[PDB]
Structure 1
Amino acid sequence: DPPGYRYAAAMVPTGSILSTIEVASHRRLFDFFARVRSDENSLY
């Protein structure tokens, strides 16, 4: 349902997240939430 994360505009970020937290703890916050192993194809 939700639109994919846009990888090409993350290559130039606006700003850095300060916190360090396990993100999957609270999943319900997000819209599109992807969890990835070392690498995948989609990124490419």
Structure 2
Amino acid sequence: RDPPGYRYAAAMVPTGSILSTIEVASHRRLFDFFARVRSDENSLY
């Protein structure tokens, strides 16, 4: 449905910290927006 998109500003001031570190992107569609960026992308600015 053209889902939402990640809010970059809101990031920078997290409301919590994810304890588990794991290779995400296996659990791809648990989210309706998943973006995987590598070194960095053009789309974050």
TM-score grouping bracket, smaller chain normalisation: 0.7 to 0.9
Q: Which has the higher helix share?
A: 1
Unpaired stretches in structure 2, ≥5 consecutive residues? none
* Count of equivalent residues: 44
Unpaired stretches in structure 1, ≥5 consecutive residues? none
* Distance (Å, rounded) in 2 between the aligned partners of 1:40 and 1:24: 17
Greater shift, 6-15 or 20-29, is seen at: 20-29
- Dislocated runs of 4+, deviation >2 Å: none
* Distance (Å, rounded) in 2 between the aligned partners of 1:26 and 1:40: 21
Alpha-carbon distance, 1:27 to partner: 0.9
**What TM-score results when the alignment is normalised by the length of structure 1?**
0.87
